[PDB]
């Protein structure tokens, strides 16, 4: 129903040069903050209007936390290289994602924290937020180190407390946009390949949030096998786009219906090519 998520990417650079630390924060599908250690004088920066007037202390607090995170990740990246017997000549990637979800009732549903090394699962907090699952023997070292300081309790405290409190404050500050779904604007276009065949492309435009289902049916039967379904993509203005296309014989376009389900629609839509 609603969520706040942070995403960390730490990339070591070979031999000399410290790593590149980038963090972004999201409420649902809206980014609100970015931090890039490569900046001139790097600091947390607003990426959404509803955090811009939070005041300098808020932003000095975030910036200091970001900077300390980047220093931590630099040691972490050296530790990880040692766990896997990796030389300094190579670039490696440490990723972390954590956040909290609210349910339909507006209240805490789950917390999560997940880490990956070179694009593969490394270690994850279990959903009870009280222990970890390690993907390999290296990650079991990390787990033991985190257990030594009993770090699950502070993650739980943050995820079930600070994360939820601040998610609800961001959701209030940005109620005008964050709590208003934008229904997809939908239409069907017609593209001949020959006089005997045409592509029917069903469009969904300007919607929010990103979650959507687009489907072609032929005489009411699901044409999942013959459907070219493009991945949902950002329009660049905070809304999203998707289309689904099917190749039909000429003269039979009316047997084909497109179906779109979305949060901003009170019930699934049904449309067909209108020549």
């Amino acid at each position: 129903s609603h969520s706040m998520r942070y995403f960390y990417t730490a990339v070591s650079r070979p031999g000399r040069g410290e790593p590149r630390f980038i963090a972004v924060g999201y409420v649902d599908d809206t980014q609100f903050v970015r931090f890039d250690s490569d900046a001139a004088s790097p600091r947390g920066e607003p990426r959404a209007p509803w955090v811009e007037q939070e005041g300098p202390e808020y932003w000095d607090r975030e910036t200091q936390k970001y900077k300390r995170q980047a220093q931590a990740d630099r040691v972490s990246l050296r530790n990880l290289r040692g766990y896997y017997n990796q030389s300094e000549a190579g670039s490696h990637t440490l990723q972390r994602m954590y956040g909290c979800d609210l349910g339909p009732d507006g209240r805490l549903l789950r917390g999560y924290d997940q880490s990956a090394y070179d694009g593969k699962d490394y270690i994850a907090l279990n959903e009870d937020l009280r222990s970890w699952t390690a993907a390999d023997t290296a990650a079991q070292i990390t787990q033991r180190k985190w257990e030594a300081a009993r770090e699950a309790e502070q993650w739980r405290a943050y995820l079930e407390g600070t994360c939820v409190e601040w998610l609800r404050r961001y959701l209030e500050n940005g109620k005008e946009t964050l709590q208003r779904a934008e229904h997809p604007k939908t239409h069907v276009t017609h593209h001949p390949v020959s006089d005997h065949e045409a592509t029917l492309r069903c469009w969904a435009l300007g919607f929010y949030p990103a979650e959507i289902t687009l489907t072609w049916q032929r005489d009411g039967e699901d044409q999942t096998q013959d459907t070219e379904l493009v991945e949902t993509r950002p329009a660049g203005d905070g809304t999203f786009q998707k289309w689904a296309a099917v190749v039909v014989p000429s003269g039979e376009e009316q047997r084909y219906t497109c179906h779109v389900q979305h949060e901003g629609l009170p019930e699934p839509l049904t449309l067909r090519w209108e020549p």
């Binding site: 954590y98 490394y122 985190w146």
Partner: peptide
């Protein structure tokens, strides 16, 4: 806001 980076290195 960010989780305070008092959690440990990997």
């Amino acid at each position: 806001i960010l989780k305070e980076p008092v959690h440990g290195v990997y």
